[PDB]
Amino acid sequence: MAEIWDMVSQNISAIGDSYLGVYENVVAVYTDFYQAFSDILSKMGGWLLPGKDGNTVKLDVTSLKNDLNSLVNKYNQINSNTVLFPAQSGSGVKVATEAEARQWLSELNLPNSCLKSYGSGYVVTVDLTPLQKMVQDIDGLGAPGKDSKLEMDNAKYQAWQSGFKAQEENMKTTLQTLTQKYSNANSLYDNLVKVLSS
After folding, report:
1. Residues followed by a break in the chain, C–N over 2.5 Å?
2. What stretch or stretches form a coiled coil here?
């Protein structure tokens, strides 16, 4: 027999497998998270109406701002649906050492805002600064009319909307970054196995 080699192979696999595990969790939580933000983007057209003579437009800042806040509050929590690291499972929250967190914080290339503390330890959550920034700007447009909607001229509208898609893109970028990284992690696991099975 070749008991040491087996031992070696099993050990390396576990390391690469372990690594791939975290990422599978990261990718899930984020693609899922973004899905929820897409369901909002679809409704986007249903909250827009031209002024009267396309000289202005009426935007349902309320409905929008409320769905954004709902999403931000849902993912502002801590559970198997909002934490990227460590993987959450079952009863009570699972926490990591600040160092362990900060490490992943750097690995996933995420901002410090993504680092949250829970009792004895820490956890890494999705980046909400974008959504929050969105909601801030929507409030920056001014108070709505008695119909809770805000009629604004095209200059203002398309200005806001540029800034809105700037934030929409930030989140788009993160979800990519994390998928590329997950793809590498996964490639790596498969390569390790070939190198060890042969």
Report:
1. none
2. 165-192
Q: What is the DSSP letter of 55?
A: S
For 155, phi then psi, to 5°, come to: -55, -65
Resolution (angstroms) equals: 3.0
d(CA 198, CA 195): 6
The continuous run of DSSP H or E covering 172 comes out as helix 154-197
Pick from 145, 141, 144: nearest CA to 158: 141
Sheet holding 121-125, edge to edge: 83-85, 121-125, 115-118
Q: Are 153 and 106 in contact, with CB atoms under 8 Å apart?
A: no
Elucidation method: X-ray
Name residues whose C-beta falls within 8 Å of residue 90's C-beta, 6 or more positions apart in sequence.
none
Query: What is the H or E stretch that residue 3 is in?
Result: helix 3-43
Please name the amino acid found at residue 36: A
